[PDB]
Amino acid sequence: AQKPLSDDEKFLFVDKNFVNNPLAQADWSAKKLVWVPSEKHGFEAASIKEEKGDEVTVELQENGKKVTLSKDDIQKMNPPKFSKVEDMAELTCLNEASVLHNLRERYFSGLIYTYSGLFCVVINPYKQLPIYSEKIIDMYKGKKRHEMPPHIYAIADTAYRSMLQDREDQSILCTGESGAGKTENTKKVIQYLAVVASSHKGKQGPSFSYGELEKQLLQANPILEAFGNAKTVKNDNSSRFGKFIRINFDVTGYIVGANIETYLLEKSRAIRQAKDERTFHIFYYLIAGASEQMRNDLLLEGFNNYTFLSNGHVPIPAQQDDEMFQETLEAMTIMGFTEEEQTSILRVVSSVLQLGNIVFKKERNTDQASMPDNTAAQKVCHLMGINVTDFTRSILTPRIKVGRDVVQKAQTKEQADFAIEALAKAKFERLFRWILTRVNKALDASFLGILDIAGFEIFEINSFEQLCINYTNEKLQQLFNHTMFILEQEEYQREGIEWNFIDFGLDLQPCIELIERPTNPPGVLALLDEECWFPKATDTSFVEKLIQEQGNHAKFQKSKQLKDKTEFCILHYAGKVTYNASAWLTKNMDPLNDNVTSLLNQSSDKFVADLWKDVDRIVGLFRTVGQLYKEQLTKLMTTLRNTNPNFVRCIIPNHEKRAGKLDAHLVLEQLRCNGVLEGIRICRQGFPNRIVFQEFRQRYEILAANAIPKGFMDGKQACILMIKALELDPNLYRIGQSKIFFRTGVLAHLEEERDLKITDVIIAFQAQCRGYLARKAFAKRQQQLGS
Amino acid sequence: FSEEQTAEFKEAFQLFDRTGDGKILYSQCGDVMRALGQNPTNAEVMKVLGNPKSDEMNLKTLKFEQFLPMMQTIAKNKDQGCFEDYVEGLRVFDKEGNGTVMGAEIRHVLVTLGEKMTEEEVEQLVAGHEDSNGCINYEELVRMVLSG
Ligand SMILES: Nc1ncnc2c1ncn2[C@@H]1O[C@H](COP(=O)(O)OP(=O)(O)O)[C@@H](O)[C@H]1O
Ligand code: ALF
Ligand SMILES: [Mg+2]
């Protein structure tokens, strides 16, 4: 019996205005209706025909077919009154089936965001739904949890307030496998907070003039997306590096600052891209968006004139690199990069590409490939503000200085490249990290944390990168497991409430030790670290040793007798993966020709100057990559544990990159390895809300004005009185030592009431304010008149 | 209303027309009543406006002679707020009997309950009463709008 919904609202709102048809309300008699297996639906509707002990006969309420399955392969169905629910934690039946079902429906109906107890699921639409707009922003602004439907803008506001309420920093962590939308959902959270919390200069979809800084806070992400994102067999615009954005608020609740902690930038691909994959967007953008003039200015020959672009020039669906340029060019300006300050950041790109043309053909005479062609490095050295001859020698004949010797030597064709290669390759990273601090230079008591890590990805060649990436992914998940089941139950113990433990069986510590732990049973990273510092050792040598230590690790497994490639497997949470240990020691060391290194360190070109200005760590003969990372990633894991987590579990619908297509089991597993169900049991089982004896007799005393006597009284007891005063059911709450533990919703209703008990007064007061606020601003226009 | 004031009322009413016909858009009625030291709630104003509609509330006009009859009708009312209760309500948002509420929580309530105000409205109000910790002392803020 409710309002009518615009075709659009039907995308975030449930259609409930219909007739109370008793068709379903009558069919209920087929009570024998249950859920059961389906090699094509994951589960499907059917009704019991005959219960025969451990087994039972049933007929598909679908194919009319009659099949009998074990009396344990069937799953209770939820009433018709639950169709397309908002909070799974509501349906009177929790199942891998129902939970799936619900998600399936809402999904096809056009709604992707759904609540699951505390955290919330979010199946990628892959389509341009219309549920993000100034219009919708203001709809959710201030709106409680229930005063509106599950939507991202909601999680954002729920946190942003929670922060200002109990004064305690927060985090919004987007999980989900690669592609599931970890990124987008982040861009929104900022999008929302950029208007809902910004301060205004006084004063339709995106139509709105934001503050001065929020302006930039907005144009940042579209920059890092350039030199940092690239097309892959899993995502046309994949985030090629974890990212943790930090937004800073004052006491009044306004945005004032913003930091960005970038992580594992897979800059490898800057030299060679896999099949049907691309390099960092910006590259293509430049080779195309390049202006005729500036075109030559950086020696930007067309596509396929550069060898760092495997698969030549591959195109991206629905995206036009041509314009893409300006967009980012436009961004850079918004951000702050000086007119020329950019032109530069561009040449340094072409440079990172030309350095790829440079050749070194073997020499069967001396056996030290040479520079049969100048043009190549000829150009390259120009963009570097350095010199040819020097570069050349340095690049070919390393006038190095090992230990107590000026060991002057000359490398082999290969080495001649492994350098010119791993040089440009690192010259790149020197850029990202630079911009990032240029961006972070403008964007910069409370902070909101948004985490966009790279999602579990697992292609053909499972290199090192993929190892730390799927490592973090395993890492993060475990965080959710801790804070969700482990931690929560400890406090139940602490406060000493009537509670018994529950083992949700959700731990991956093991699979972390196998790759994290150092001394004692070493971790995959450990070995590859030291074994990386010993001559008679090779990736192979490594692996073999790898088998030595781990070997029988419950989470380890040996390859398909391809130690030729020498690969290993590890049982992640998202599944098994066969990594190729090859070239791991090299990457893990990150070496490079210091000759040319320092050569630049004082180059004529200032930009390249300051870029390299810090070369003291180069290798010409300190800390290991795996531990350099693994060290900062503990810094991150540290603050997160010091903030309040808000999980937004993204979920991939299909691998066909198809919209409207939703693979049952693929989505069934995700809900399995992510801990959704369990993640909901405790929300129903335990008491996810708690409040200390003082704040309780404080907020809701207005409800029982005569429960507590005029005299003083012990916080606890004194407030237990007013609990009897509300005749609260002894199953909703749980009194503890210092705080009370309530059940879901119990506190919400308590809040509602209180807000009602005071509305009028507010109404009353509000008036006098408009009064006061008025007589004054009128008696103001009077001065400009009397002026 | 003694002619003495009635005579001045005109001075106030007149002091309210951007163009010049001598008409106060059905909207302005509120502020003009306020400016005359009136604190009519949002309803008390519509009730004596025949409950028009947004659109026509920006078209319809008023002339003192037809306005005056309302100024009074309001002027004489049944109740009014007062420190006594006024603050008694805000003191319910006093996180911990400190005697002060966060200029953000106050800023909320005021724009999410009853006659919902605007983000700017509240800004202009509390603005300058928040301390280092952005803490406002209602007791005072109360008196401010009041005695003011
Ligand atoms: N809510 C959404 N609206 C529109 N497109 C989306 C949405 N969620 C994800 N996408 C689509 O999915 C793609 C990749 O999702 P993405 O955020 O890049 O995942 P991840 O960060 O996990 O790699 C995008 O290129 C886009 O087409
Ligand atoms: F780009 Al992703 F997981 F965020 F592959
Ligand atoms: Mg991403």
mmCIF file of all heavy atoms in Angstrom, chain A residues 299-333:
data_model
loop_
_atom_site.group_PDB
_atom_site.id
_atom_site.type_symbol
_atom_site.label_atom_id
_atom_site.label_comp_id
_atom_site.label_asym_id
_atom_site.label_seq_id
_atom_site.Cartn_x
_atom_site.Cartn_y
_atom_site.Cartn_z
ATOM 1 N N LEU A 299 59.788 12.247 -29.707
ATOM 2 C CA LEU A 299 60.103 11.190 -30.664
ATOM 3 C C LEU A 299 59.102 10.064 -30.474
ATOM 4 O O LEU A 299 59.451 8.923 -30.148
ATOM 5 C CB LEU A 299 61.530 10.698 -30.441
ATOM 6 C CG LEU A 299 62.571 11.815 -30.565
ATOM 7 C CD1 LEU A 299 63.561 11.763 -29.406
ATOM 8 C CD2 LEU A 299 63.277 11.669 -31.893
ATOM 9 N N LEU A 300 57.842 10.413 -30.686
ATOM 10 C CA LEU A 300 56.748 9.481 -30.520
ATOM 11 C C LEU A 300 56.270 8.864 -31.827
ATOM 12 O O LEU A 300 55.223 9.231 -32.361
ATOM 13 C CB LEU A 300 55.590 10.187 -29.807
ATOM 14 C CG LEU A 300 55.990 10.882 -28.500
ATOM 15 C CD1 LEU A 300 55.300 12.232 -28.371
ATOM 16 C CD2 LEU A 300 55.625 9.984 -27.335
ATOM 17 N N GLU A 301 57.051 7.925 -32.345
ATOM 18 C CA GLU A 301 56.693 7.227 -33.569
ATOM 19 C C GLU A 301 55.364 6.527 -33.302
ATOM 20 O O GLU A 301 54.979 6.337 -32.146
ATOM 21 C CB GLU A 301 57.776 6.205 -33.913
ATOM 22 C CG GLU A 301 59.127 6.500 -33.249
ATOM 23 C CD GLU A 301 60.157 5.404 -33.484
ATOM 24 O OE1 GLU A 301 59.751 4.251 -33.751
ATOM 25 O OE2 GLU A 301 61.372 5.691 -33.398
ATOM 26 N N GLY A 302 54.660 6.149 -34.363
ATOM 27 C CA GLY A 302 53.376 5.489 -34.197
ATOM 28 C C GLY A 302 53.423 4.174 -33.437
ATOM 29 O O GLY A 302 54.453 3.792 -32.881
ATOM 30 N N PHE A 303 52.296 3.470 -33.417
ATOM 31 C CA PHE A 303 52.223 2.192 -32.724
ATOM 32 C C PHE A 303 52.978 1.131 -33.522
ATOM 33 O O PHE A 303 53.125 1.240 -34.740
ATOM 34 C CB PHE A 303 50.759 1.768 -32.543
ATOM 35 C CG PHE A 303 50.041 2.504 -31.447
ATOM 36 C CD1 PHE A 303 49.487 3.755 -31.681
ATOM 37 C CD2 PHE A 303 49.922 1.949 -30.180
ATOM 38 C CE1 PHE A 303 48.822 4.445 -30.669
ATOM 39 C CE2 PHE A 303 49.261 2.631 -29.164
ATOM 40 C CZ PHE A 303 48.711 3.882 -29.409
ATOM 41 N N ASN A 304 53.454 0.109 -32.825
ATOM 42 C CA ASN A 304 54.187 -0.980 -33.460
ATOM 43 C C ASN A 304 55.553 -0.548 -33.977
ATOM 44 O O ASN A 304 56.184 -1.243 -34.778
ATOM 45 C CB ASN A 304 53.353 -1.577 -34.592
ATOM 46 C CG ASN A 304 52.189 -2.392 -34.075
ATOM 47 O OD1 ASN A 304 51.929 -3.501 -34.550
ATOM 48 N ND2 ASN A 304 51.480 -1.847 -33.086
ATOM 49 N N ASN A 305 55.996 0.615 -33.515
ATOM 50 C CA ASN A 305 57.303 1.141 -33.879
ATOM 51 C C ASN A 305 58.136 0.972 -32.612
ATOM 52 O O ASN A 305 59.342 1.217 -32.598
ATOM 53 C CB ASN A 305 57.199 2.622 -34.258
ATOM 54 C CG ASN A 305 56.453 2.840 -35.566
ATOM 55 O OD1 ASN A 305 56.689 3.820 -36.274
ATOM 56 N ND2 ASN A 305 55.547 1.926 -35.889
ATOM 57 N N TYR A 306 57.453 0.540 -31.549
ATOM 58 C CA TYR A 306 58.053 0.306 -30.236
ATOM 59 C C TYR A 306 57.902 -1.174 -29.889
ATOM 60 O O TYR A 306 56.870 -1.785 -30.166
ATOM 61 C CB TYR A 306 57.358 1.172 -29.184
ATOM 62 C CG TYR A 306 57.381 2.651 -29.504
ATOM 63 C CD1 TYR A 306 56.838 3.143 -30.690
ATOM 64 C CD2 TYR A 306 57.959 3.551 -28.625
ATOM 65 C CE1 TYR A 306 56.878 4.494 -30.987
ATOM 66 C CE2 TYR A 306 58.007 4.898 -28.903
ATOM 67 C CZ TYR A 306 57.471 5.373 -30.083
ATOM 68 O OH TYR A 306 57.554 6.729 -30.347
ATOM 69 N N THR A 307 58.929 -1.747 -29.276
ATOM 70 C CA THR A 307 58.896 -3.168 -28.953
ATOM 71 C C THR A 307 58.398 -3.504 -27.557
ATOM 72 O O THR A 307 58.197 -4.674 -27.230
ATOM 73 C CB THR A 307 60.285 -3.817 -29.149
ATOM 74 O OG1 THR A 307 61.109 -2.960 -29.950
ATOM 75 C CG2 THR A 307 60.147 -5.170 -29.844
ATOM 76 N N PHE A 308 58.197 -2.486 -26.732
ATOM 77 C CA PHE A 308 57.705 -2.718 -25.384
ATOM 78 C C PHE A 308 56.204 -2.997 -25.396
ATOM 79 O O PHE A 308 55.630 -3.372 -24.379
ATOM 80 C CB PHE A 308 57.995 -1.506 -24.505
ATOM 81 C CG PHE A 308 59.359 -1.525 -23.886
ATOM 82 C CD1 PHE A 308 60.085 -0.346 -23.738
ATOM 83 C CD2 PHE A 308 59.915 -2.720 -23.442
ATOM 84 C CE1 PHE A 308 61.346 -0.357 -23.154
ATOM 85 C CE2 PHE A 308 61.168 -2.742 -22.859
ATOM 86 C CZ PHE A 308 61.888 -1.557 -22.714
ATOM 87 N N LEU A 309 55.581 -2.814 -26.558
ATOM 88 C CA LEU A 309 54.158 -3.036 -26.718
ATOM 89 C C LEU A 309 53.884 -4.349 -27.433
ATOM 90 O O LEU A 309 53.757 -4.390 -28.651
ATOM 91 C CB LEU A 309 53.528 -1.869 -27.483
ATOM 92 C CG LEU A 309 54.222 -0.522 -27.231
ATOM 93 C CD1 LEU A 309 54.383 0.217 -28.544
ATOM 94 C CD2 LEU A 309 53.417 0.305 -26.250
ATOM 95 N N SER A 310 53.812 -5.427 -26.655
ATOM 96 C CA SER A 310 53.513 -6.754 -27.177
ATOM 97 C C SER A 310 52.082 -6.695 -27.692
ATOM 98 O O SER A 310 51.288 -5.855 -27.251
ATOM 99 C CB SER A 310 53.615 -7.794 -26.063
ATOM 100 O OG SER A 310 53.772 -7.174 -24.799
ATOM 101 N N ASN A 311 51.743 -7.590 -28.610
ATOM 102 C CA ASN A 311 50.398 -7.596 -29.186
ATOM 103 C C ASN A 311 50.170 -6.239 -29.861
ATOM 104 O O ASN A 311 49.039 -5.761 -29.940
ATOM 105 C CB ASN A 311 49.301 -7.791 -28.115
ATOM 106 C CG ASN A 311 49.642 -8.853 -27.083
ATOM 107 O OD1 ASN A 311 49.464 -10.052 -27.321
ATOM 108 N ND2 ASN A 311 50.113 -8.412 -25.918
ATOM 109 N N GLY A 312 51.242 -5.614 -30.334
ATOM 110 C CA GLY A 312 51.102 -4.318 -30.978
ATOM 111 C C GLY A 312 50.102 -3.421 -30.269
ATOM 112 O O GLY A 312 50.066 -3.386 -29.038
ATOM 113 N N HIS A 313 49.291 -2.696 -31.037
ATOM 114 C CA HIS A 313 48.285 -1.817 -30.456
ATOM 115 C C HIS A 313 46.941 -2.527 -30.323
ATOM 116 O O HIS A 313 46.247 -2.747 -31.318
ATOM 117 C CB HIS A 313 48.106 -0.557 -31.309
ATOM 118 C CG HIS A 313 46.816 0.172 -31.057
ATOM 119 N ND1 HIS A 313 45.603 -0.475 -30.922
ATOM 120 C CD2 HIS A 313 46.549 1.496 -30.934
ATOM 121 C CE1 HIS A 313 44.649 0.415 -30.728
ATOM 122 N NE2 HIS A 313 45.195 1.620 -30.730
ATOM 123 N N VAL A 314 46.580 -2.882 -29.092
ATOM 124 C CA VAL A 314 45.311 -3.535 -28.823
ATOM 125 C C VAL A 314 44.358 -2.449 -28.344
ATOM 126 O O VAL A 314 44.758 -1.529 -27.625
ATOM 127 C CB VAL A 314 45.455 -4.608 -27.741
ATOM 128 C CG1 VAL A 314 44.135 -4.792 -26.999
ATOM 129 C CG2 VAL A 314 45.874 -5.904 -28.372
ATOM 130 N N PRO A 315 43.084 -2.544 -28.730
ATOM 131 C CA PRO A 315 42.078 -1.565 -28.349
ATOM 132 C C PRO A 315 41.268 -2.000 -27.131
ATOM 133 O O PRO A 315 41.164 -3.192 -26.814
ATOM 134 C CB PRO A 315 41.221 -1.480 -29.590
ATOM 135 C CG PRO A 315 41.200 -2.928 -30.063
ATOM 136 C CD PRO A 315 42.483 -3.588 -29.574
ATOM 137 N N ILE A 316 40.678 -1.012 -26.468
ATOM 138 C CA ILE A 316 39.866 -1.240 -25.288
ATOM 139 C C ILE A 316 38.396 -0.903 -25.563
ATOM 140 O O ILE A 316 38.059 0.215 -25.966
ATOM 141 C CB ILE A 316 40.385 -0.389 -24.124
ATOM 142 C CG1 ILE A 316 39.601 -0.719 -22.859
ATOM 143 C CG2 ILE A 316 40.321 1.093 -24.482
ATOM 144 C CD1 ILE A 316 40.490 -1.052 -21.695
ATOM 145 N N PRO A 317 37.504 -1.878 -25.350
ATOM 146 C CA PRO A 317 36.064 -1.701 -25.572
ATOM 147 C C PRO A 317 35.439 -0.539 -24.821
ATOM 148 O O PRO A 317 35.720 -0.321 -23.644
ATOM 149 C CB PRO A 317 35.458 -3.040 -25.147
ATOM 150 C CG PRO A 317 36.516 -3.714 -24.334
ATOM 151 C CD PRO A 317 37.825 -3.235 -24.881
ATOM 152 N N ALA A 318 34.594 0.207 -25.524
ATOM 153 C CA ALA A 318 33.881 1.351 -24.950
ATOM 154 C C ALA A 318 34.758 2.506 -24.491
ATOM 155 O O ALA A 318 34.261 3.506 -23.964
ATOM 156 C CB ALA A 318 33.024 0.878 -23.787
ATOM 157 N N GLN A 319 36.063 2.367 -24.686
ATOM 158 C CA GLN A 319 36.992 3.404 -24.273
ATOM 159 C C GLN A 319 37.804 3.903 -25.461
ATOM 160 O O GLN A 319 38.306 3.112 -26.256
ATOM 161 C CB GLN A 319 37.916 2.858 -23.184
ATOM 162 C CG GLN A 319 38.610 3.920 -22.351
ATOM 163 C CD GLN A 319 39.832 3.378 -21.628
ATOM 164 O OE1 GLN A 319 39.732 2.861 -20.508
ATOM 165 N NE2 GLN A 319 40.997 3.496 -22.265
ATOM 166 N N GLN A 320 37.913 5.222 -25.585
ATOM 167 C CA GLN A 320 38.672 5.827 -26.674
ATOM 168 C C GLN A 320 39.931 6.501 -26.130
ATOM 169 O O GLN A 320 39.873 7.590 -25.553
ATOM 170 C CB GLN A 320 37.814 6.849 -27.426
ATOM 171 C CG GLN A 320 38.524 7.514 -28.603
ATOM 172 C CD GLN A 320 37.653 7.600 -29.846
ATOM 173 O OE1 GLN A 320 36.998 6.626 -30.234
ATOM 174 N NE2 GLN A 320 37.641 8.773 -30.480
ATOM 175 N N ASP A 321 41.066 5.836 -26.320
ATOM 176 C CA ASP A 321 42.352 6.338 -25.856
ATOM 177 C C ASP A 321 42.584 7.754 -26.365
ATOM 178 O O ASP A 321 43.127 8.601 -25.652
ATOM 179 C CB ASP A 321 43.475 5.409 -26.333
ATOM 180 C CG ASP A 321 43.332 3.982 -25.788
ATOM 181 O OD1 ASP A 321 42.883 3.823 -24.630
ATOM 182 O OD2 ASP A 321 43.668 3.020 -26.515
ATOM 183 N N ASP A 322 42.150 8.002 -27.597
ATOM 184 C CA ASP A 322 42.286 9.312 -28.231
ATOM 185 C C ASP A 322 41.915 10.415 -27.248
ATOM 186 O O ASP A 322 42.732 11.276 -26.921
ATOM 187 C CB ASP A 322 41.372 9.420 -29.461
ATOM 188 C CG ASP A 322 41.323 8.138 -30.284
ATOM 189 O OD1 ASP A 322 41.499 7.030 -29.726
ATOM 190 O OD2 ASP A 322 41.101 8.242 -31.504
ATOM 191 N N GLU A 323 40.667 10.378 -26.787
ATOM 192 C CA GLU A 323 40.154 11.367 -25.842
ATOM 193 C C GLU A 323 40.742 11.126 -24.462
ATOM 194 O O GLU A 323 41.130 12.066 -23.763
ATOM 195 C CB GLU A 323 38.625 11.283 -25.773
ATOM 196 C CG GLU A 323 38.067 9.878 -26.005
ATOM 197 C CD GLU A 323 36.557 9.855 -26.223
ATOM 198 O OE1 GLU A 323 36.075 10.576 -27.129
ATOM 199 O OE2 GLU A 323 35.855 9.113 -25.491
ATOM 200 N N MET A 324 40.793 9.854 -24.084
ATOM 201 C CA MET A 324 41.332 9.437 -22.802
ATOM 202 C C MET A 324 42.477 10.339 -22.409
ATOM 203 O O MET A 324 42.606 10.730 -21.255
ATOM 204 C CB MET A 324 41.813 7.995 -22.893
ATOM 205 C CG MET A 324 40.766 7.008 -22.433
ATOM 206 S SD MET A 324 39.814 7.706 -21.067
ATOM 207 C CE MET A 324 38.178 7.161 -21.450
ATOM 208 N N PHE A 325 43.301 10.675 -23.391
ATOM 209 C CA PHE A 325 44.437 11.548 -23.167
ATOM 210 C C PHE A 325 43.978 12.824 -22.468
ATOM 211 O O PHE A 325 44.263 13.042 -21.293
ATOM 212 C CB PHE A 325 45.088 11.885 -24.508
ATOM 213 C CG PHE A 325 46.515 12.333 -24.401
ATOM 214 C CD1 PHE A 325 47.528 11.414 -24.176
ATOM 215 C CD2 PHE A 325 46.844 13.679 -24.546
ATOM 216 C CE1 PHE A 325 48.849 11.820 -24.096
ATOM 217 C CE2 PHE A 325 48.162 14.104 -24.468
ATOM 218 C CZ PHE A 325 49.170 13.171 -24.242
ATOM 219 N N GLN A 326 43.246 13.657 -23.197
ATOM 220 C CA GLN A 326 42.759 14.919 -22.656
ATOM 221 C C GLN A 326 42.171 14.763 -21.266
ATOM 222 O O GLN A 326 42.521 15.503 -20.350
ATOM 223 C CB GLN A 326 41.713 15.527 -23.590
ATOM 224 C CG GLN A 326 41.620 17.047 -23.497
ATOM 225 C CD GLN A 326 42.710 17.765 -24.294
ATOM 226 O OE1 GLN A 326 43.303 17.196 -25.222
ATOM 227 N NE2 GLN A 326 42.977 19.024 -23.931
ATOM 228 N N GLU A 327 41.277 13.790 -21.118
ATOM 229 C CA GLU A 327 40.644 13.538 -19.834
ATOM 230 C C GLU A 327 41.699 13.567 -18.727
ATOM 231 O O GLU A 327 41.591 14.318 -17.754
ATOM 232 C CB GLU A 327 39.934 12.177 -19.861
ATOM 233 C CG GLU A 327 38.442 12.246 -19.518
ATOM 234 C CD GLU A 327 37.636 11.090 -20.101
ATOM 235 O OE1 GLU A 327 37.707 9.975 -19.536
ATOM 236 O OE2 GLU A 327 36.926 11.298 -21.117
ATOM 237 N N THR A 328 42.730 12.750 -18.897
ATOM 238 C CA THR A 328 43.803 12.672 -17.921
ATOM 239 C C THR A 328 44.654 13.925 -17.985
ATOM 240 O O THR A 328 45.169 14.393 -16.970
ATOM 241 C CB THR A 328 44.707 11.460 -18.171
ATOM 242 O OG1 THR A 328 45.827 11.869 -18.952
ATOM 243 C CG2 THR A 328 43.949 10.353 -18.896
ATOM 244 N N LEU A 329 44.821 14.464 -19.185
ATOM 245 C CA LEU A 329 45.599 15.678 -19.319
ATOM 246 C C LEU A 329 44.855 16.695 -18.471
ATOM 247 O O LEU A 329 45.425 17.355 -17.596
ATOM 248 C CB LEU A 329 45.647 16.128 -20.780
ATOM 249 C CG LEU A 329 47.061 16.185 -21.357
ATOM 250 C CD1 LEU A 329 47.906 17.169 -20.532
ATOM 251 C CD2 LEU A 329 47.685 14.793 -21.324
ATOM 252 N N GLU A 330 43.556 16.783 -18.731
ATOM 253 C CA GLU A 330 42.667 17.688 -18.018
ATOM 254 C C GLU A 330 42.791 17.475 -16.514
ATOM 255 O O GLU A 330 42.856 18.423 -15.733
ATOM 256 C CB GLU A 330 41.219 17.427 -18.440
ATOM 257 C CG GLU A 330 40.872 17.859 -19.858
ATOM 258 C CD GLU A 330 39.366 17.980 -20.080
ATOM 259 O OE1 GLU A 330 38.754 18.931 -19.540
ATOM 260 O OE2 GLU A 330 38.794 17.125 -20.794
ATOM 261 N N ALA A 331 42.805 16.211 -16.116
ATOM 262 C CA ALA A 331 42.914 15.873 -14.713
ATOM 263 C C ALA A 331 44.187 16.485 -14.156
ATOM 264 O O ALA A 331 44.138 17.346 -13.273
ATOM 265 C CB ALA A 331 42.920 14.348 -14.538
ATOM 266 N N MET A 332 45.321 16.058 -14.702
ATOM 267 C CA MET A 332 46.622 16.539 -14.255
ATOM 268 C C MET A 332 46.608 18.022 -13.912
ATOM 269 O O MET A 332 47.160 18.434 -12.891
ATOM 270 C CB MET A 332 47.686 16.250 -15.317
ATOM 271 C CG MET A 332 48.059 14.772 -15.416
ATOM 272 S SD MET A 332 49.623 14.418 -16.243
ATOM 273 C CE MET A 332 49.086 14.203 -17.973
ATOM 274 N N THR A 333 45.965 18.823 -14.758
ATOM 275 C CA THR A 333 45.886 20.263 -14.530
ATOM 276 C C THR A 333 45.053 20.555 -13.288
ATOM 277 O O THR A 333 45.477 21.306 -12.406
ATOM 278 C CB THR A 333 45.260 20.990 -15.742
ATOM 279 O OG1 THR A 333 44.084 20.292 -16.168
ATOM 280 C CG2 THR A 333 46.238 21.037 -16.897
#
